[PDB]
């Protein structure tokens, strides 16, 4: 029995229970809630340290011996913020807890046994979160995938065939042959992938064929015609096949207004993209659907957080993508009904209130694929600066707000697209898609990505250097990124129907192929920490937003965190 000062203990093994750590350069403070360690029995790797033959590596290991163990990791998950060791076996998370050798240490369970087959990854002073999930990908260029990978995203869900004009507008992979093209192209990449089909048709047979061809759901986009008939048919087919539907509603109100669209949805599960409407949607009041029980409301990162440069940038961006002219009054009228700084301001507060549940990209289609996580944490920091600490906090920390915002890109999109049994959280039994963060760089620049239980990307110095640290340091592909190893580390998500018909063997796919499930029986109440339903009213004239009778707004930010301190460009 010896006494150790908290300072040297934290320097050796990381923060322990009751300690607090700042996240990046923000004002969000994370407090360690619990510790799974036995004081005096910590796992350390190095010369003369504990992780050695006969001390912490067992000479008589259990049969569930780990392949990889992450020691002294601070886990930031929606299930809690705590210190533990993470054991990885066969691409899954095998255990969370103490970890070590049962011959020499007390509290070691068989699923956390370190033996001669175990690799050691030091996590002391580091944060472990689940890999991010981006559910609004326009597959416009393959170069988006490495960019999203380097920011902490491990699953991309969306649609497209490339730089075609249909893809530049829509997240749609249309038809069986184009699905086959994209599924065979997917074998290249270090990313979990799933593809959305075209929902914009009234032909049930055409809808069903795309699902059986491997798509995990439908996208309904106004550029292919978002009409109530197509919405109704697509929802009927999706209910028969248990796949998700995403919608980009009619901004022009051509076939009807927002209530007509809700009537076409008819109380069935729907995932709405850019619900605030700058990215498209019933002008000016698409944002009202974010209070409905059957809606899963997502936002795209270009509108968060609301800043002084946001409105002009979005205006000029809209004038370019739609080829509008400033000398035409009708184009101006369209643009003014579309941007609405009022709804953009309201969107940040709705994220703080838990009304919006998912953050996404809309990549290269008015969105930045490498900035979903960064803009989510910028929004959290701005909201804490404006509204102060949340009232759901328990202690001098921001743990509740941290969980609320972390769920927006990890667990809620996974639940929304029926993959939350594989990815989305640091839980035992799930796929080992993990991101290592140093707290000083949290939310902007990760340390390394573990994909399928193996290291796939990391910061790395020059190959000729005597150690891995010296400059230049940038993100480089690791061994799970190469050869036949990438087939074991990566998943292609398909529908249950396509999986049952042997889509993997028919198309000769070497990646893991998994079916999505539980997409039709979820509501807004199934989103973690973002399950607030409310009556949202939008003023047709002033465009003001009222939630439960009270006006909701935020003020723009002239400076954000996690932006110019961390990037050269």
């Amino acid at each position: 029995m010896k006494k150790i000062s908290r300072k040297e203990y934290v320097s050796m093994y990381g923060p322990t229970t009751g300690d607090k750590v700042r996240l990046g350069d923000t004002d969000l403070i994370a407090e360690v809630e619990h510790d799974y360690t036995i004081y005096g029995e910590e796992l350390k790797f190095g010369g003369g340290k504990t992780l050695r033959e006969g001390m912490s590596q067992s000479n008589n290991p259990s049969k569930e011996e780990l392949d990889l163990i992450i020691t002294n990791a601070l886990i930031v998950d929606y299930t809690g913020i705590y210190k533990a060791d993470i054991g990885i076996k066969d691409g899954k998370i095998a255990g969370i807890g103490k970890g070590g050798n049962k011959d020499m240490q007390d509290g070691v369970k068989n699923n956390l046994s370190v033996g001669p087959a175990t690799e050691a990854l030091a996590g002391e002073g580091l944060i472990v979160t689940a890999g991010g999930i981006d559910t609004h990908i326009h597959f416009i260029s393959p170069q988006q995938i490495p960019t999203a990978f380097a920011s902490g995203v491990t699953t991309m869900i969306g649609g497209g065939t490339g730089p075609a004009d249909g893809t530049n507008a829509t997240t749609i992979t249309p038809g069986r042959r184009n699905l086959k093209w994209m599924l065979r192209a997917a074998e290249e990449y270090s990313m979990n992938l799933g593809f959305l089909a075209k929902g914009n048709t009234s032909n049930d047979a055409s809808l069903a064929d795309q699902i059986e061809a491997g798509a995990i759901g439908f996208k309904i986009h106004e550029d292919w015609g978002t009409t109530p008939s197509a919405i109704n048919h697509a929802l009927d087919v999706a209910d028969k096949y248990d796949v998700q539907v995403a919608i980009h509603t009619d901004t022009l109100n051509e076939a009807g207004c927002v209530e007509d669209t809700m009537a076409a949805i008819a109380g069935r599960t729907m995932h709405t993209f850019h619900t605030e409407g700058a990215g498209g949607g019933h002008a000016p009041d698409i944002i009202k659907v974010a209070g409905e029980h059957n809606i899963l409301p997502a936002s795209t990162n270009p509108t968060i957080p609301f800043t002084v440069n946001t409105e002009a940038e979005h205006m000029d961006m809209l004038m370019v993508c739609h080829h509008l002219d400033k000398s035409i009054k009708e184009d101006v009228q369209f643009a003014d009904s579309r941007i609405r700084p009022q709804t953009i301001a309201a969107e940040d507060t709705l994220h703080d209130m838990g009304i919006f549940s998912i953050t996404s990209s809309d990549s290269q289609a008015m969105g930045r694929v490498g900035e979903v996580i960064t803009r989510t944490w910028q929004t959290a920091d701005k909201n804490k600066k404006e509204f102060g600490r949340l009232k759901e906090e328990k202690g001098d920390n921001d743990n509740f707000r941290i969980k609320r915002y972390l769920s927006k890109y990890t667990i809620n999109p996974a639940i929304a697209h029926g993959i939350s049994e594989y990815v989305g959280s640091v839980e035992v039994g799930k796929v080992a898609d993990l991101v290592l963060w140093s707290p000083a760089f949290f939310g902007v620049k990760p340390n390394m990505i573990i994909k399928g239980g193996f290291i796939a990307l990391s910061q790395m110095g020059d190959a000729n250097a005597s150690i891995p640290t010296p400059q230049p340091v940038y993100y480089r592909e690791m061994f799970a990124h190469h050869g036949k190893a990438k087939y074991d580390a990566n998943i292609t998500f398909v529908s249950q129907a396509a999986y049952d018909k042997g889509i993997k063997e028919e198309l000769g796919l070497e990646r893991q192929v998994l079916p999505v499930k539980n997409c039709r029986n979820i509501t807004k109440k199934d989103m973690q920490f973002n399950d607030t339903t409310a009556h949202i009213e939008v003023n047709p004239e002033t465009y003001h937003v009222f939630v439960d009778g009270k006006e909701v707004t935020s003020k723009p930010a002239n400076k954000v965190s996690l932006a110019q301190l961390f990037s050269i460009f």
């Binding site: 069935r268 409905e292 029980h293």
Partner: protein
């Protein structure tokens, strides 16, 4: 003889009861098995004699064993002895309820309860609705039935009951005799509020938009107390 399996089982039971009666004659205090068997064998023999009705045997099964005839703890373990016996008019089930009275202190499986009450449906506000059964038949409604879709013969302000259930103990029920009028408490249905079945009046997400469809469907199908405004506007999916 052409004995059936039932006859072999009943013969075994008769001789278990015979052993119990012999031990009782010897002065041994009977245990659980012996008491059960003695009651069952007595009922079977009485039904064979054919001089008593089944109800008489149900009452007579309670006088066979005094509390002093059994071991401590036996009386509290025998809630009911059921036995099927063949009377002159065929096979009838005779059940004896609490045949033996408790006299000791031993209670196997005794429950030691806290005296605090349980608060069910906490955080749910209850409204009160007056309901009358204008039909000629009794109606009973369980705790988790969607009260908007109860028997169309019940009359009440259905609009106020949409998306609600009875604020009573789970698995209990409220009865409505023909012509009976009483008020009940209704709480909001929890979870995802996805109402499927019950009369096919909703079969979708419960909300204000679907309440209009439900009210219109209820009025078309003659559910009492339904007042959905005329000039109804249909949606694309009804």
């Amino acid at each position: 003889m052409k004995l059936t399996p039932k006859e072999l089982d009943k013969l075994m039971l008769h001789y278990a009861g015979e052993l119990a009666r012999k031990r009782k004659e010897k002065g041994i205090k009977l245990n659980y098995v012996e008491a059960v068997a003695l009651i069952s064998a007595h009922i079977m023999e009485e039904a064979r004699a054919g001089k008593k009705t089944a109800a008489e045997l149900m009452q007579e099964g309670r006088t066979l064993l005094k509390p002093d005839d059994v071991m401590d703890g036996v009386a509290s373990m025998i809630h009911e002895v059921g036995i099927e016996a063949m009377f002159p008019d065929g096979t009838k089930l005779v059940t004896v309820h609490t045949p033996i009275e408790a006299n000791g202190k031993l209670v196997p499986g005794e429950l030691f309860l806290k005296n605090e009450d349980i608060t069910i449906n906490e955080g749910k506000k209850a409204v009160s609705v007056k309901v009358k059964n204008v039909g000629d038949r009794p109606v009973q409604i369980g705790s988790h039935f969607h009260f908007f879709e109860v028997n169309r013969c019940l009359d009440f302000d259905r609009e106020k009951t949409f998306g609600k259930r009875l604020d009573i103990a789970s698995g209990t029920a409220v009865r409505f005799e023909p012509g009976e009028e009483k008020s009940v408490e209704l709480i909001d249905i929890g979870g995802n509020r996805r109402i499927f079945g019950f009369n096919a009046l909703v079969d979708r997400q419960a909300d204000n938009e679907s309440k209009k469809i439900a009210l219109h469907r209820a009025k078309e199908r003659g559910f009492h107390g339904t007042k959905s405004d005329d000039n109804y506007v249909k949606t694309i999916k009804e």
